[PDB]
Design a protein around this ligand. Structure first.
Ligand SMILES: *[C@@H]1O[C@H](CO)[C@@H](O[C@@H]2O[C@H](CO)[C@@H](O[C@@H]3O[C@H](CO)[C@@H](O)[C@H](O)[C@@H]3O)[C@H](O)[C@H]2NC(C)=O)[C@H](O)[C@H]1NC(C)=O
Ligand SMILES: *[C@@H]1O[C@H](CO)[C@@H](O[C@@H]2O[C@H](CO)[C@@H](O[C@@H]3O[C@H](CO)[C@@H](O)[C@H](O)[C@@H]3O)[C@H](O)[C@H]2NC(C)=O)[C@H](O)[C@H]1NC(C)=O
Ligand SMILES: *[C@@H]1O[C@H](CO)[C@@H](O[C@@H]2O[C@H](CO)[C@@H](O)[C@H](O)[C@H]2NC(C)=O)[C@H](O)[C@H]1NC(C)=O
Ligand SMILES: *[C@@H]1O[C@H](CO)[C@@H](O[C@@H]2O[C@H](CO)[C@@H](O)[C@H](O)[C@H]2NC(C)=O)[C@H](O)[C@H]1NC(C)=O
Ligand SMILES: *[C@@H]1O[C@H](CO)[C@@H](O[C@@H]2O[C@H](CO)[C@@H](O)[C@H](O)[C@H]2NC(C)=O)[C@H](O)[C@H]1NC(C)=O
Ligand SMILES: *[C@@H]1O[C@H](CO)[C@@H](O[C@@H]2O[C@H](CO)[C@@H](O)[C@H](O)[C@H]2NC(C)=O)[C@H](O)[C@H]1NC(C)=O
Ligand SMILES: *[C@@H]1O[C@H](CO)[C@@H](O[C@@H]2O[C@H](CO)[C@@H](O)[C@H](O)[C@H]2NC(C)=O)[C@H](O)[C@H]1NC(C)=O
Ligand SMILES: *[C@@H]1O[C@H](CO)[C@@H](O[C@@H]2O[C@H](CO)[C@@H](O)[C@H](O)[C@H]2NC(C)=O)[C@H](O)[C@H]1NC(C)=O
Ligand SMILES: *[C@@H]1O[C@H](CO)[C@@H](O[C@@H]2O[C@H](CO)[C@@H](O)[C@H](O)[C@H]2NC(C)=O)[C@H](O)[C@H]1NC(C)=O
Ligand SMILES: *[C@@H]1O[C@H](CO)[C@@H](O[C@@H]2O[C@H](CO)[C@@H](O)[C@H](O)[C@H]2NC(C)=O)[C@H](O)[C@H]1NC(C)=O
Ligand SMILES: *[C@@H]1O[C@H](CO)[C@@H](O[C@@H]2O[C@H](CO)[C@@H](O)[C@H](O)[C@H]2NC(C)=O)[C@H](O)[C@H]1NC(C)=O
Ligand SMILES: *[C@@H]1O[C@H](CO)[C@@H](O[C@@H]2O[C@H](CO)[C@@H](O)[C@H](O)[C@H]2NC(C)=O)[C@H](O)[C@H]1NC(C)=O
Ligand SMILES: *[C@@H]1O[C@H](CO)[C@@H](O[C@@H]2O[C@H](CO)[C@@H](O)[C@H](O)[C@H]2NC(C)=O)[C@H](O)[C@H]1NC(C)=O
Ligand SMILES: *[C@@H]1O[C@H](CO)[C@@H](O[C@@H]2O[C@H](CO)[C@@H](O)[C@H](O)[C@H]2NC(C)=O)[C@H](O)[C@H]1NC(C)=O
Ligand SMILES: *[C@@H]1O[C@H](CO)[C@@H](O)[C@H](O)[C@H]1NC(C)=O
Ligand SMILES: *[C@@H]1O[C@H](CO)[C@@H](O)[C@H](O)[C@H]1NC(C)=O
Ligand SMILES: *[C@@H]1O[C@H](CO)[C@@H](O)[C@H](O)[C@H]1NC(C)=O
Ligand SMILES: *[C@@H]1O[C@H](CO)[C@@H](O)[C@H](O)[C@H]1NC(C)=O
Ligand SMILES: *[C@@H]1O[C@H](CO)[C@@H](O)[C@H](O)[C@H]1NC(C)=O
Ligand SMILES: *[C@@H]1O[C@H](CO)[C@@H](O)[C@H](O)[C@H]1NC(C)=O
Lengths: 409, 41, 168, 165, 50
C-alpha cells in the first residue's frame, strides 16, 4: 500500500482481518517452511528485472593508467568512446583499491573484466527497502502464532489466522539485523540445534541499538558519456579533505545488551560457563565485515570493537567502526553477474536499529567451561527467516464424512 | 578482454566452412554475409 | 607463533601411540600424509571424526595442548602426522610433523665402511631404526633397501645409533 | 563428486617464474575458497594462499610479494604463479578446497594427487669415476646413471653416488 | 584451444593434431545389407509388380 516493484503488487485492503482461533494448538517449524525459499526467489527476480533497462558497461574494460585514508583511492585515466563512432576521448575517474587489480605499476584494470561486464545501476531507481505483504491464494490460509515465548520449533497454542503478513522490509545485512521486528518480552535465542555448532544462532532483541554513519568525503559526480544515450557516472574531485567512512554504536547500550544476550544464552549452555566473544574468522569480505547499504553506498564495517568481551558468572562514549566502500557489487553470489553502483553526491548518514545478531559457536569439547561466539552471515535466507518465523501456510480440505442416525428416503 | 589490445591467434578450419575473398591466401568464414553463428556450449 | 611436536614416535604392533601438540589457542585438526600419497584428515576438530576413518584415532584437547591417540597401531598408518590451527594474521599455522613408525622386525646394528681418497666417503648399511647421525658435509635421507632395511652414505667418521657408536 | 587435478612443468630454472594449474571436475566454483599448498621435506606442510570466485585473494605472509593466484570460472580452472624461485622452493604442490564461511574449524578438502617440481641450476656434466673396494661418481647431472647407493644432492646442484662390492 | 574474445567469452578452436591425419569413415556390414535389401525388394515386388 524504486527497485522493489510496487506496480506488480496488487493493493491490499486498508484494514486487515485477524480471526483468533480458539482451542487450537498447531506445530510450527521456522527452519523448514517454504515461505522463505519462495521469498528468496522473489527477491532475486524483482532485483534482476530492474537492472534490465539499465546500461551495460562493456566498453569500459580498458587499460587504466592509475596514479595515487591512504592508498584507498586511485586516480585512473583511460581512453573512452564518444557518441560519434569516429572519435575518442581521454577521461579520468577516482576508483577504489577494492575495485581494481594490477595487470603486471601504473597499470590497472577492473576486477570483473575476466568474468563479466557489470551492469550500472540506474541513477533514478532507489535502493530503499519498502514493506511487502505476502498474501495467500484462494483456498489457503496463513496461521500466525501469537505466543510471546515461542522459540521457532514446536507446538504453538495461540494460533490465529490472518489475511496477509505484516510489512517485511527486504533489508540485506551481515552480522547484524538492521531495521527488523523486535521481541516483546525477552531476548530470544533461536537455533535449529543448540548442541550442534554448525548451526547459526539467531538472536532477537527486545530493545533497539541506534547506529549513525558518515561518509565525510564531499563527492562530485560527473557523467562521462559513452555513446548514444548511454552514460557512465564516475567520481570527480573531492572537495576538502579525504577521511575514511565510519559508523558508531553507543557503548552504554551495547554493554548490557550483550549482558541480556549472555543471560539468555546461559539457559542453554549452563549456569557457570564463561561466555566469550571474538571479532570474526571468515575469509570473504562480505562474511568478515558487517556489509550493508547506507544511503545508496555499500558499506563494509569492521565490527571488531563490538564483539570483544568476556563474561564470567559472579556515559556518552561511543565505539567507532571504520568501514570500507566498494562499487563493484556481486550481491546474490551468482557467478558472472556484477553491478556497478554510481556515486552519490554529498554526505551520507545512516540511522538504523540493530534488532538482532547472527552468531556462530565454536565447539571443541563435550564438557566445556567456556564458550566462544563469533558473528556469521553469508546466506541471506537467515535475514528473512527472523521475520517469517510465526507464519505457516496451510490448505483447506472441506470434505468430511461422519456417522449420524439418519438415512436418505 | 581489454578492448584496446589485440592478439594474433591461429586455428585449423575445415575446407567446407571457409571461402575465398581474393605466399598465403586470404579467406573468410562462409556465413560472413548472411548471419552470425552461435557457438554451442 | 610456533607449534611444537615431537620429531618421532616409535611403538610396537598392538601398542597405542600418542602425539602431542602445543601452543594452540583454537581448535586443532590433524592431517595424515604418506610418501607418494595425498594428505587426508583423520580428526577434523578437537575430538570429532569424519566418515570413512576407523575408530582407532581419538583426540582430546586440554588447555593449550591437543593430543591424538592411535589405538592398536599396525603395519598400516606408519606415516607422518601434522596439526593445523587457525590464526588471525597467518590464516593457517601448521605443525612441525611427527613420524609414527612400527617395529615389525628386531633391531640390527649397521655396518660402516670408510674409503680414503680428496673425497672421504663412509657407507652405512643394514640397520632397522633409520634415525642415524653421522659426525666427523652432505648426508642422505636413509632410504629403504631391498631386504626391508636401511642404508645411507656420507661425503666430505663416527656414527651414532640408539645405544651405540661406531668410529672409523 | 568434485575432483582436482594439477598440471605444470617439473623442472624450473632458478630466478624464474613457476606456474601451475589446477583443474576441477564436477561441482561449481561458487561458495568455495580454492587453496594452494606445498609439502616440503625440510619444513613440512605449508599453506600458500586461497582465492574466492569474486576475485578476492588471500596469500601467506611468508610468500607475500612473489605469489599470484587467479581463477577462470568459464573453464572451471585456477592457477598459481610464484616469482623468483630459489633452490629451497622445491616441494610437492597440492590444490585443495575450503567451504565458504568461518575458518576457525575448517579443514582442507578435495586434495589433488600432487605435482612435484624441482628448482635446480641445470649445468649438464658428465660423470667422473674414481676407484677406491668400490667405485665413486664425483659429479654428474641429471638423474640417473647405472652401474648401488642412492644419489646425493650436493649444495652445488650436482649429484653423486657410490658403489661397493 | 580456448581464445578469450571478450569478458567471459571464449572461442573453442581446433589446435594441433597429434599423430597422423586420416579420413573419417562409416563401416556397414555387407552380407547383412544384402539380406536386408533382399527383404526390401521382396515386398517392393509385392507392391510394384511381380
Ligand atoms: C580480530 O582481531 C585481531 C586482534 O584482536 C586482529 O588481528 C590483528 O590483525 C592485524 C592486521 O591484520 C595484525 O597486524 C599486523 O601484525 C604484524 C606484526 O608483526 C605485521 O605484519 C603488520 O604490520 C600488522 O601490524 C595484528 O598482528 C593482529 N593481531 C593479532 C593479535 O594477531 C584481526 O585482524 C581481527 N580479525 C578480523 C577483523 O577479521
Ligand atoms: C533503516 O531505516 C532508516 C529509516 O527509514 C533508513 O534511513 C533512511 O535512509 C534513506 C536512504 O535513502 C534516507 O533517504 C534519503 O535521505 C535524504 C533526505 O531526504 C536524501 O538523500 C534522499 O532524498 C533520501 O530521502 C532517509 O532519510 C533515512 N531516514 C532517516 C530518518 O534519516 C536506513 O537507511 C535503514 N537502514 C537500512 C540498512 O536499510
Ligand atoms: C587526477 O588526475 C588528473 C589528470 O589525469 C588531474 O587533472 C588535472 O589536475 C591538474 C591540477 O589541478 C590541472 O592543472 C589539470 O588541468 C587537470 N587535467 C585535466 C585533464 O583535467 C586531477 O586533478 C587528479 N585528481 C585528483 C588528484 O584528485
Ligand atoms: C588514450 O589514447 C591515446 C591515443 O592513442 C594514448 O596515447 C598513446 O599511447 C600509446 C600507448 O602505446 C603510446 O605509445 C603513445 O606515445 C601515446 N601518445 C600518442 C600521441 O600516440 C593514451 O595512452 C591513452 N590513454 C590511456 C591508455 O590512459
Ligand atoms: C527504532 O526503534 C524505535 C523504538 O522501538 C522505533 O520507534 C518507535 O516507532 C514506532 C513505529 O510504529 C512507534 O509506534 C513508537 O512509538 C516508536 N517508539 C519510540 C520510543 O519512539 C523506531 O521507529 C525504530 N526505527 C526504525 C528505523 O525502524
Ligand atoms: C524449542 O522449544 C521446544 C519446546 O520446549 C523444545 O522441544 C523439546 O525438545 C527436546 C529435545 O530433546 C525434547 O526432548 C522435548 O520433548 C521437546 N519438548 C518440550 C515441551 O520440552 C525445543 O528443543 C526448543 N528448541 C531450541 C531451544 O532450539
Ligand atoms: C543436535 O546435535 C547433536 C550434536 O551433534 C546431536 O547429537 C549427536 O547425535 C549423533 C547421531 O546423530 C550421535 O552419534 C552423537 O553421539 C550425538 N552427540 C552428542 C554430543 O550427543 C543431535 O542428534 C542433534 N539433534 C538432532 C535432532 O539431530
Ligand atoms: C562517531 O563518534 C566520533 C567520536 O567518538 C565522532 O567524531 C567526532 O566528530 C566531531 C564532529 O565533527 C568532531 O568535532 C570530533 O573531533 C570527532 N572526534 C574525534 C575523536 O575525532 C564522529 O563524528 C561520530 N560519527 C557519527 C556520529 O556518525
Ligand atoms: C560540498 O561542496 C559543495 C560545492 O562546494 C557545497 O555546495 C555549496 O554549499 C553552500 C552552503 O549551502 C552554498 O552556499 C554554495 O552555493 C554551494 N556551492 C558552491 C559551489 O560553493 C556543499 O555544501 C558541500 N557539502 C557540504 C556537506 O558541506
Ligand atoms: C544518532 O543520531 C541521533 C540524531 O539523529 C542522536 O540523537 C541525539 O542525541 C543527542 C545527545 O543525547 C540529543 O541532544 C539530540 O536531541 C538527539 N537528536 C534526536 C533527533 O533525537 C543519537 O545520539 C545518535 N546516536 C549515537 C551517536 O549513537
Ligand atoms: C579491525 O579493527 C581492529 C581494531 O579496531 C584492527 O586491529 C588493529 O589492526 C592494526 C593494523 O595496523 C594493528 O596495528 C592494531 O594493533 C590492531 N589492534 C588490535 C587491538 O589488535 C583490525 O586490523 C581491523 N581489521 C581489518 C583492517 O581487517
Ligand atoms: C554469401 O557469399 C557466398 C560466397 O561467395 C555466396 O555463395 C555463392 O554465391 C554465388 C552467387 O553468384 C554462387 O555462384 C556460388 O555458387 C555460391 N557459392 C560459393 C561456394 O561460392 C552467397 O550467395 C552469398 N550470400 C548472399 C549474397 O546473400
Ligand atoms: C599452423 O600454422 C602455425 C603458424 O601460423 C604453426 O605454428 C608454428 O609451428 C611451427 C612448427 O615448426 C613452430 O616452430 C612455430 O613456433 C609455430 N608458431 C606459432 C606462432 O605458434 C602451426 O604449427 C600450424 N599448425 C599445424 C601445421 O597443424
Ligand atoms: C561395429 O562395432 C562393434 C563393436 O566393436 C562390432 O561388434 C563386434 O563384432 C565382432 C565380430 O565382428 C565380435 O567378435 C565382437 O564381440 C563385437 N563386439 C562387441 C562389443 O560386441 C561390430 O561388428 C562392428 N560392425 C561392423 C564392422 O559392421
Ligand atoms: C603512490 O602510489 C603507490 C602505489 O604503489 C603507493 O604505494 C604510494 O604510497 C603512493 N605515494 C607515494 C608518496 O609514493
Ligand atoms: C585475468 O586478468 C589478468 C590481468 O590482465 C590476466 O593476467 C589473467 O590472465 C586473466 N585471467 C584469465 C583466465 O584470462
Ligand atoms: C541456573 O540459575 C538460575 C538463576 O535464576 C536458576 O533459576 C536455575 O535453577 C539454575 N539452574 C540449575 C540447573 O541450577
Ligand atoms: C578489546 O579491545 C581493546 C581496546 O580496543 C583491545 O586492546 C583488546 O586487545 C581487545 N581484546 C582482545 C581480546 O583482543
Ligand atoms: C611425423 O613425421 C615423422 C617423419 O615421417 C615421423 O617419424 C613422426 O612419427 C610423425 N609424427 C607423429 C607425431 O606421428
Ligand atoms: C508372384 O510370383 C511368385 C513366383 O514364385 C508366385 O509364387 C506368386 O504367387 C506370385 N504372386 C502373384 C500375386 O501373382
Amino acid at each position: 500500500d524504486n527497485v522493489w516493484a510496487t506496480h506488480a503488487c496488487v493493493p491490499t485492503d486498508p484494514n486487515p482481518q485477524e480471526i483468533h482461533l480458539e482451542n487450537v494448538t498447531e506445530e510450527f517449524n521456522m527452519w523448514k517452511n517454504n515461505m522463505v525459499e519462495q521469498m528468496h526467489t522473489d527477491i532475486i527476480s524483482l532485483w534482476d528485472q530492474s537492472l534490465k533497462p539499465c546500461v551495460k558497461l562493456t566498453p569500459l574494460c580498458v587499460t587504466l593508467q592509475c596514479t595515487n585514508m591512504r592508498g584507498e583511492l586511485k586516480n585512473c585515466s583511460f581512453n573512452m568512446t564518444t557518441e560519434l563512432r569516429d572519435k575518442k576521448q581521454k577521461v579520468y575517474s577516482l576508483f577504489y583499491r577494492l575495485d581494481v587489480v594490477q595487470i603486471n605499476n601504473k597499470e590497472y584494470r577492473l576486477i570483473n573484466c575476466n568474468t563479466s561486464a557489470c551492469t550500472q545501476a540506474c541513477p533514478k531507481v532507489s535502493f530503499e527497502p519498502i514493506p511487502i505483504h505476502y498474501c495467500a491464494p484462494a483456498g489457503f490460509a496463513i496461521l500466525k502464532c501469537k505466543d510471546k515465548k515461542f522459540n521457532g520449533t514446536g507446538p504453538c497454542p495461540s494460533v490465529s489466522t490472518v489475511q496477509c503478513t505484516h510489512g517485511i522490509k527486504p533489508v540485506v545485512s551481515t552480522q547484524l539485523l538492521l531495521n527488523g521486528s523486535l521481541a516483546e518480552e525477552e531476548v530470544m535465542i533461536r537455533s535449529e540445534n543448540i548442541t550442534n555448532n554448525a548451526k547459526n544462532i539467531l538472536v532477537q532483541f527486545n530493545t533497539p541499538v541506534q547506529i549513525n554513519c558518515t561518509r565525510p568525503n564531499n563527492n562530485t559526480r560527473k557523467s562521462i558519456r559513452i555513446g548514444p544515450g548511454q552514460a557512465f557516472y564516475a567520481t570527480g574531485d573531492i572537495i576538502g579533505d579525504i577521511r575514511q567512512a565510519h559508523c558508531n554504536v553507543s557503548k552504554a547500550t551495547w554493554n548490557e545488551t550483550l549482558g541480556k544476550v549472555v543471560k539468555q544464552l546461559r539457559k542453554h549452555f549452563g549456569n557457570n560457563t564463561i561466555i566469550r566473544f571474538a571479532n570474526s574468522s571468515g575469509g570473504d569480505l562480505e562474511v568478515t565485515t558487517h556489509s550493508f547499504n547506507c544511503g545508496g553506498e555499500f558499506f563494509y564495517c569492521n565490527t571488531s570493537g563490538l564483539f570483544n568481551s568476556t563474561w564470567i558468572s559472579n556515559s556518552n562514549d561511543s565505539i567507532t567502526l571504520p568501514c570500507r566502500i566498494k562499487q563493484i557489487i556481486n550481491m546474490w553470489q551468482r557467478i558472472g553477474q556484477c553491478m556497478y553502483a554510481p556515486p552519490i553526491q554529498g554526505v551520507i548518514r545512516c540511522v538504523s536499529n540493530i534488532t538482532g545478531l547472527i552468531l556462530t559457536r565454536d565447539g571443541g569439547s563435550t564438557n566445556s567451561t567456556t564458550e566462544t561466539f563469533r558473528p556469521g552471515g553469508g546466506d541471506m535466507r537467515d535475514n528473512w527467516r527472523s521475520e517469517l518465523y510465526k507464519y505457516k501456510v496451510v490448505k483447506i480440505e472441506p470434505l468430511g464424512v461422519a456417522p449420524t442416525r439418519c438415512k436418505r428416503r | 578482454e581489454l578492448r584496446d589490445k589485440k592478439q594474433k591467434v591461429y586455428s585449423l578450419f575445415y575446407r567446407l566452412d571457409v571461402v575465398q575473398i581474393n605466399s598465403n591466401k586470404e579467406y573468410r568464414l562462409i556465413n560472413c554475409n548472411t548471419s552470425a553463428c552461435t557457438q554451442a556450449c | 607463533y610456533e607449534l611444537t611436536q615431537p620429531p618421532s614416535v616409535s611403538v610396537s604392533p598392538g601398542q597405542t601411540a600418542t602425539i602431542t601438540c602445543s601452543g594452540a589457542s583454537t581448535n586443532v585438526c590433524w592431517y595424515q600424509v604418506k610418501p607418494g600419497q595425498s594428505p587426508e584428515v583423520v580428526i577434523f576438530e578437537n575430538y570429532k571424526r569424519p566418515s570413512g576413518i576407523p575408530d582407532r584415532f581419538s583426540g582430546s584437547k586440554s588447555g593449550s595442548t591437543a593430543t591424538l591417540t592411535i589405538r592398536g597401531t599396525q603395519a598400516i598408518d606408519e606415516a607422518d602426522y601434522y596439526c593445523q590451527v587457525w590464526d588471525s594474521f597467518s590464516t593457517f599455522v601448521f605443525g612441525s610433523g611427527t613420524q609414527v613408525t612400527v617395529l615389525g622386525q628386531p633391531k640390527a646394528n649397521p655396518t660402516v665402511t670408510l674409503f680414503p681418497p680428496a673425497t672421504l666417503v663412509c657407507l652405512i648399511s643394514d640397520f632397522y631404526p633409520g634415525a642415524v647421525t653421522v659426525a666427523w658435509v652432505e648426508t642422505t635421507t636413509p632410504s629403504k633397501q631391498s631386504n626391508n632395511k636401511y642404508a645411507a652414505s656420507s661425503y666430505l667418521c663416527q656414527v651414532t645409533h640408539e645405544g651405540s657408536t661406531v668410529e672409523k | 563428486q568434485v575432483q582436482l587435478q594439477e598440471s605444470g612443468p617439473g623442472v624450473v630454472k632458478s630466478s624464474e617464474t613457476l606456474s601451475l594449474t589446477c583443474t576441477v571436475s564436477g561441482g561449481s566454483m561458487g561458495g568455495t575458497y580454492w587453496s594452494w599448498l606445498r609439502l616440503s621435506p625440510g619444513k613440512g606442510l605449508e599453506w600458500i594462499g586461497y582465492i574466492f570466485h569474486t576475485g578476492e585473494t588471500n596469500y601467506s605472509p611468508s610468500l607475500k610479494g612473489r605469489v599470484s593466484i587467479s581463477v577462470d570460472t568459464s573453464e572451471d580452472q585456477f592457477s598459481l604463479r610464484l616469482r623468483s624461485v630459489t633452490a629451497a622452493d622445491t616441494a610437492v604442490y597440492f590444490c585443495a578446497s575450503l567451504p565458504r564461511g568461518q575458518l576457525v574449524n575448517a579443514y582442507f578438502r578435495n586434495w589433488g594427487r600432487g605435482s612435484l617440481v624441482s628448482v635446480t641450476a641445470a649445468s649438464t656434466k658428465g660423470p667422473s669415476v674414481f676407484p677406491l673396494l668400490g667405485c665413486l661418481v664425483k659429479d654428474y647431472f641429471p638423474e640417473p646413471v647405472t652401474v648401488t647407493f642412492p644419489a646425493v644432492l650436493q649444495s652445488s646442484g650436482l649429484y653423486s653416488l657410490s658403489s661397493v662390492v
